[PDB]
Amino acid sequence: MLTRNRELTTVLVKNLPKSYNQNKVYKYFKHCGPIIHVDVADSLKKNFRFARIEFARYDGALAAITKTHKVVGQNEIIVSHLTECTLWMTNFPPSYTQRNIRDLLQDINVVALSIRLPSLRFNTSRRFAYIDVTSKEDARYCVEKLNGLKIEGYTLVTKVSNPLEKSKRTDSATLEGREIMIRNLSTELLDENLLRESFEGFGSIEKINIPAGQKEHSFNNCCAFMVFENKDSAERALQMNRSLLGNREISVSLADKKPFLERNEVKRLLASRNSKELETLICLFPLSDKVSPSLICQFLQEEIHINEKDIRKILLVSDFNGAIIIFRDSKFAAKMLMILNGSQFQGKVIRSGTINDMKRYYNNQQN
RNA sequence: GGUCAAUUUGAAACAAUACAGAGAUGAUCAGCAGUUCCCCUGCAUAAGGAUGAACCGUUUUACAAAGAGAC
Ligand SMILES: [Cl-]
Ligand SMILES: [Cl-]
Ligand SMILES: [K+]
Ligand SMILES: [K+]
Numbered sequence: 287m288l289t290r291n292r293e294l295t296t297v298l299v300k301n302l303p304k305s306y307n308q309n310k311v312y313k314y315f316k317h318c319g320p321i322i323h324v325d326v327a328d329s330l331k332k333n334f335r336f337a338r339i340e341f342a343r344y345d346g347a348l349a350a351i352t353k354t355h356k357v358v359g360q361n362e363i364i365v366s367h368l369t370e371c372t373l374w375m376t377n378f379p380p381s382y383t384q385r386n387i388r389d390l391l392q393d394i395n396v397v398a399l400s401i402r403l404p405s406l407r408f409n410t411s412r413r414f415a416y417i418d419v420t421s422k423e424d425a426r427y428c429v430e431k432l433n434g435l436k437i438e439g440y441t442l443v444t445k446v447s448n449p450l451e452k453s454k455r456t457d458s459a460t461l462e463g464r465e466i467m468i469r470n471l472s473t474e475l476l477d478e479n480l481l482r483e484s485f486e487g488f489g490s491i492e493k494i495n496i497p498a499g500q501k502e503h504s505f506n507n508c509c510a511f512m513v514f515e516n517k518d519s520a521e522r523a524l525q526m527n528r529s530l531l532g533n534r535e536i537s538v539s540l541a542d543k544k545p546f547l548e549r550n551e552v553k554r555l556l557a558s559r560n561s562k563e564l565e566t567l568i569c570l571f572p573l574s575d576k577v578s579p580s581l582i583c584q585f586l587q588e589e590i591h592i593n594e595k596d597i598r599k600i601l602l603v604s605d606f607n608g609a610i611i612i613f614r615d616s617k618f619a620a621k622m623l624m625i626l627n628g629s630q631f632q633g634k635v636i637r638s639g640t641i642n643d644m645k646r647y648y649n650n651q652q653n
Numbered sequence: 654g655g656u657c658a659a660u661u662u663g664a665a666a667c668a669a670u671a672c673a674g675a676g677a678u679g680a681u682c683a684g685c686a687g688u689u690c691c692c693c694u695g696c697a698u699a700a701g702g703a704u705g706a707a708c709c710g711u712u713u714u715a716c717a718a719a720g721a722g723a724c
Contacts, residue, residue: 287676288676289674289676290674290676292674292676374673374674376671376672377671377672378671379671404673404674404675404676404677405674405675405677406677407675407677407678407681407682408677408678408679408681409678409681411670412671412674412677413670413671413672414671414672414673414674416673416674440670441671443672445673447673448673449673449674449676451673452673453672454672455671455672456669456671456672457668457669457672458672459668460668465668467666467667469665469715469716470663470664470716470717493668495666495667495668496667497666497667497668498665498667499665500664500665503665505663506663507663507664507716507717508664508665509664509665509667510665510667511666511667511668513668527715527716528715528716534716535717536715536716537715537716538715541666541667542679543679543681545678545681546678546679546681548681549679549681549682550681552681553681554660557659557660558660559659559660560660560661604682605681605682652706652707653706
């Protein structure tokens with residue numbers, strides 16, 4: 287659990303003159319110690335400015351705090367540790383942006399100093415944010431107003447940040463190594479009570495899940511998932527791998543997680559030579575590793591005016607600082623190509639191209 | 654047609670979308686090992702050091718069917 291604690295390195299400066307931007311907060315405080323990052327924000331009535339400064343070390347911060355109550359051309363500033371001012375927020379809509387979060391707070395009259403979103407490099411689905419406000423009391427006010435708020439059909443979660451209090455995820459059985467997947471069952475074997483009787487001896491079973499539609503399209507091979515109450519039981523159930531059940535040699539293994547599956551689907555595309563498949567897709571690059579496929583979807587629909595039905599899938603390729611958009615057909619993909627190349631996304635200009643173009647652009651970013 | 658196979662198919666990824674920062678990761682983008690070059694200490698083609706970058710190996714791998722290509 288021990289990693290870092292920003293309240294030892296990060297200070298809050300209150301009452302800076304309206305002229306003070308990032309650049310010149312930097313210049314004022316950089317003698318205090320080396321600085322990693324500065325953010326600046328207007329007060330509610332635009333009468334003064336707040337700054338948030340992350341120092342490289344706690345002693346840079348303590349040095350900054352020695353300037354509390356000093357005068358910066360006209361104004362008596364206050365410099366303190368930024369402590370108890372961090373919120374954590376999740377279950378906002380998939381396409382919600384840093385700006386949207388900032389307007390959310392602004393509509394309740396709360397200044398936001400910093401809003402930090404996670405890298406999607408290793409998991410495309412991550413969706414949460416940390417948000418620093420200017421007082422403990424604002425933080426409490428945000429929870430009271432925003433926790434439980436319905437936004438575009440999503441019930442928001444907003445809390446005072448405390449990672450030690452985090453909750454169990456609804457899919458944590460799989461992360462703990464407690465869920466097995468059973469493969470190559472026949473339709474005759476794809477029956478809950480049948481699997482239950484055959485696996486109960488390994489340990490107590492918590493859940494059995496059978497993906498729908500396997501009998502109904504009568505598959506040759508069917509699959510199922512089973513969650514045990516503890517790890518050891520599931521590990522014992524792996525002895526059933528390569529064993530006889532009815533007329534089948536079945537397979538049994540610990541279920542994989544979505545990020546692992548999704549990454550391998552991307553790799554398959556990145557190695558395809560099936561030009562049929564490749565004619566249907568285009569890449570956008572370069573993109574921040576914070577940008578999700580939902581945000582890209584929303585861009586495509588709201589700003590480029592594409593219909594949702596024309597878009598089959600959107601996948602991240604953060605190792606080349608891009609994304610892949612698979613369209614309904616190649617003719618549509620070819621028009622979109624010209625339209626998207628040079629378009630604006632998140633206030634910067636993006637490009638579109640084939641996979642190879644995305645690589646060339648990335649390799650050349652390396653040089 | 655014997656030995657290596659990029660890959661394809663059987664074939665279905667459930668379980669609540671979110672659910673704790675680059676504070677994240679499973680070779681998921683890894684570990685280990687090697688080669689060349691880049692960067693700082695030096696008269697330097699002597700010896701150290703930290704980064705990189707381009708490469709080369711090796712470790713790993715449910716089952717069945719089919720298979721560009723490669724001895
Ligand atoms: Cl810190
Ligand atoms: Cl925290
Ligand atoms: K903290
Ligand atoms: K390797």
